[PDB]
Symmetry: C2
Subunit: 277 residues, 2 copies
């Protein structure tokens, strides 16, 4: 089994690394803060002296602040990594950084992989993360078993860079819906409602229904045609969506609250669902 | 103990009314469509001959198509229901509709409650619905044990009309977030990504994190002071969000896709979170 390395033990790095102490190949960890590393030692991780020390691992994980730090760390590992070594980047980077680093290191058999994760420290600890991976198919196949130890969902997104691109689509939804949630709270408050109660309803019902992902049941964005079994149901949902959004927008005007995300959604929903008017 | 009535056995009414066959009070049902009635019959429900027949019950549930139909059913019930009867409306109505019927029926000492529900037919069959209830305090307390049988989450949103209004806020989020999902799907596809996989990741991770509701943990919409327990977490969320949104917007420019919901989210997120820029 693959011997693991981990560099960067921050709020996601530490728990993934902790989960990797349960991996029979074992994990060698590094971070500059003595306090990020002490608990991993207690969990049974081998503590490394330096980034170069971690380069002896077969599969080296990196979760650091930004692209600049990733390049710095990758550059240091590259001086020592043996041929066949995989380097997985889990923290936030531009997709071009993954393309670039993979491209520069391929000739020395050092395989760069961008493998952003979602969602949560707790899930990381339990090995229930989703990861979206950009890699050579051959490289993806060799590391999948290792990835499956800490991720419940492992997607091969495409070549290096594709992982990042899938993460950007996924997280654009996350943060746009957070903005939408705050808009819903502003409306609720102007209506004299308990916002914490609303929050409880939303969270309970999204656990029942699955959440925003419930509408993601199409394999392309072509407009739906009447012969499609999905057609009448999406037509139905469009009617519901347009009704409820117009009702909400009317409430917004009644209680003097601007609702620009709702307004945009109201205008665009039909076209987005593939059932335009 | 309360004897139950149910009018409208459609895709939400039927599973709700089916759950109510397990209530000790029993349920009496009516729908004009025979094929809607028969399943409820073989689940142990009593079958009414008419809407007027259903008016004998203590607590009468209504789930039908639209306002116009809600107004008619309650108008029909109003001439037959005994004083003290409660009528609970679960289908879509305007927020003024609930108030109007409440005022209309005060005469007969018939109580109106707007109790929209969320989310799903499966939840409805299992008695795990959420319901947001506009009601006078005394009638809320009378019916709460009944509601608890088919709803795992029962909110007393306020007086009549308040249920509707909480529902409007809740479903605004539902459909704005579906809009955003479709925009995300458009981006993923232009970038050459697999939509099936994107959906699997979304649904899996939202099971873990809780979804958009995870951010709805504030009493009011005031800005967070530095010692607020949510300050550093929300500030961190603002940082992550603005970075991912900006990257997403740049990717959208690169693959020639318009991302207007994302642009608006990017500009307003910080303010929405109560940690605006200084």
């Amino acid at each position: 089994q693959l011997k693991l390395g981990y560099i960067g033990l921050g709020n996601m790095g530490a728990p993934m690394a902790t989960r990797m102490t349960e991996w029979p190949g074992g994990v060698t960890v590094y971070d500059i803060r003595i306090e990020a590393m002490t608990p991993l030692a207690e969990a049974g991780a081998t503590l490394a002296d330096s980034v170069a020390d971690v380069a002896a691992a077969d599969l080296i994980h990196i979760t650091v602040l930004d692209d600049a730090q990733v390049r710095e760390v990758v550059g240091e590992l590259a001086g020592h990594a043996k041929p066949g070594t995989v380097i997985a980047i889990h923290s936030t980077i531009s997709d071009t950084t993954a393309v670039e680093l993979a491209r520069d290191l391929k000739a020395r058999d050092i395989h760069i992989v961008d493998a952003p994760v979602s969602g949560g420290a707790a899930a990381a600890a339990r090995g229930e993360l989703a990861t979206m991976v950009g890699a050579d198919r051959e490289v993806y196949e060799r590391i999948k078993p290792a990835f499956k130890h800490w991720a419940a969902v492992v997607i091969h997104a495409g070549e290096p860079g594709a992982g990042t691109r899938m993460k950007l689509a996924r997280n654009m939804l996350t943060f746009t819906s957070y903005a939408a949630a705050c808009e819903a709270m502003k409306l609720a408050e102007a209506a004299g409602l308990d916002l914490q109660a609303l929050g409880r309803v939303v969270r309970h019902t999204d656990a029942l229904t699955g959440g925003p992902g419930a509408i993601m049941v199409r394999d392309n964005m072509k407009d739906l045609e009447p012969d499609n079994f999905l057609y009448q149901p999406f037509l139905h949902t469009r009617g519901l969506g347009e009704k409820d959004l117009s009702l909400a927008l009317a409430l917004g005007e009644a209680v003097s609250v601007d609702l620009p995300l709702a307004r945009l959604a109201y205008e665009g929903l039909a076209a987005g669902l593939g059932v335009p008017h």
